[PDB]
């Protein structure tokens, strides 16, 4: 039943020092900067921030929301769950 990442899916993104965060495969805009091979363009909720990052590194949020979807100190992070809850499909700027 699972099929690839796909731009629109949320997920759990992990990078080394973070606890798994709030994050979305984004689209790639024409014109735009393109990942490295196998890799995705992750947005990061509550930070805004995009980093690029390869399957190993994504989890499904409705899977595992009740493990990692808890609130957390680090900065953006709550706000994060509350966009990806909320409205995990707008624009932020
Ligand atoms: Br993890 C995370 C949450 N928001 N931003 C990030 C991030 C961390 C490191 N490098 C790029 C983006």
Same mark, same amino acid.
């Given at each position: 039943?699972?099929?690839?990442? #796909?731009?629109?899916?949320?997920?759990?993104?992990?990078?080394?020092?973070?606890? *798994?965060?709030?994050?979305?495969?984004?689209?790639?805009? =024409?014109?735009?900067? !393109?990942?490295?091979?196998? #890799?995705?363009?992750?947005?990061?909720?509550?930070?805004?921030?995009?980093?690029?990052?390869?399957?190993? =590194?994504?989890?499904?949020?409705? !899977?595992? !929301?009740?493990?990692?979807?808890?609130?957390?100190?680090? #900065?953006?992070?709550?706000?994060?769950?509350?966009?990806?809850?909320?409205?995990? *499909?707008?624009?932020?700027?």
């Amino acid at each position: 039943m699972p099929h690839a990442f #796909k731009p629109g899916d949320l997920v759990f993104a992990k990078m080394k020092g973070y606890p *798994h965060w709030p994050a979305r495969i984004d689209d790639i805009a =024409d014109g735009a900067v !393109k990942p490295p091979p196998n #890799k995705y363009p992750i947005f990061f909720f509550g930070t805004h921030e995009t980093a690029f990052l390869g399957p190993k =590194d994504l989890f499904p949020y409705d !899977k595992c !929301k009740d493990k990692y979807g808890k609130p957390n100190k680090r #900065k953006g992070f709550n706000e994060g769950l509350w966009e990806i809850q909320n409205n995990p *499909h707008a624009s932020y700027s």
